[PDB]
Structure formats: structure tokens, C-alpha cells
């Protein structure tokens, strides 16, 4: 998990090979590509209480909101199964209204 210890990018695995007075490591890693922008909010108000994502991030393509992972675009509908609630939404800065 330590960054840049074995190759550039997120480390997947490695393979060793011999050399006349040393060793050669082949590092297999993972690199993302083809990004977009979308729009973001930190929490969502509903019925006067604030919801946060269990794991992921809120995005919107312009009209509707979804939850995704942080390393690969895969929208899903926002549900009580993948969000958790904590307190009324009067303190958080950047809250948006949705269902």
C-alpha cells in the first residue's frame, strides 16, 4: 500500500527475474483514464435530516443525483441501504435538497 514503493500507480503484483549480478522486478499496476467533471455535494437533506454516503460520493449529471465509487464511474440510485443519517441538516455547508 505504500505509495510509489513498487511502480507508478496502484500496485497490483510483481514478478522477479534474475540478472548476472542482480535482480529485475516487473511491476504490474493500475492507472485510471478518461475522466469527466460532474457536480458534487457533501450531504443530502431529506425530511429534515442529513444523509451521508456509506462508501462513495454523490454526483449529478445535471438533472439527477447518484452515488458512485471513488475510482470508477458507476452511478446508482440513492437509497437508505447505501447511505446513513446523522442529525438534522442545519450545520453542514454545501447541503443540497433531493429525495
Amino acid at each position: 500500500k505504500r505509495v510509489d514503493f513498487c511502480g507508478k500507480g496502484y500496485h497490483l503484483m510483481s514478478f522477479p527475474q534474475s540478472a548476472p549480478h542482480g535482480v529485475v522486478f516487473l511491476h504490474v499496476t493500475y492507472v485510471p483514464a478518461q475522466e469527466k467533471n460532474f457536480t458534487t455535494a457533501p450531504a443530502i437533506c431529506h425530511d429534515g435530516k442529513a444523509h451521508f454516503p456509506r462508501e462513495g460520493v454523490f454526483v449529478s449529471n445535471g438533472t439527477h443525483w447518484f452515488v458512485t465509487q471513488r475510482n470508477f464511474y458507476e452511478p446508482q440510485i440513492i437509497t437508505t441501504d447505501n447511505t446513513f443519517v446523522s442529525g438534522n441538516c442545519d450545520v453542514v455547508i454545501g447541503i443540497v435538497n433531493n429525495t
Binding site: 505504500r2 505509495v3 510509489d4 514503493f5
Partner: protein
């Protein structure tokens, strides 16, 4: 003149060799410290450890 110049030559050569060896030791120490610094820069600035 060759005798006295030879005495001076051997003395100065010995001093120079001593200086060079000390420099080599110090350089090795500095290189170790800089390797540690590079590791810290990679692991604590570009990510969370």
C-alpha cells in the same frame, strides 16, 4: 633538492589521501540521509501513510 622535495611530496600526498577518504565517508552518510528524505517525500506527501 630531490631529497627535500621528496620529503615534502610524501607528506603532502599523505594529507591529500586522508582528506579524500574522509570526504568519501561523509558522502556515503549524506546519500543515506537523502534516500530517506526521498522515501518520506514519496510516501507522506503524495499519499497518506
Amino acid at each position: 633538492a630531490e631529497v627535500q622535495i621528496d620529503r615534502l611530496i610524501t607528506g603532502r600526498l599523505q594529507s591529500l589521501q586522508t582528506y579524500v577518504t574522509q570526504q568519501l565517508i561523509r558522502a556515503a552518510e549524506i546519500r543515506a540521509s537523502a534516500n530517506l528524505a526521498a522515501t518520506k517525500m514519496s510516501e507522506c506527501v503524495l499519499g497518506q501513510s
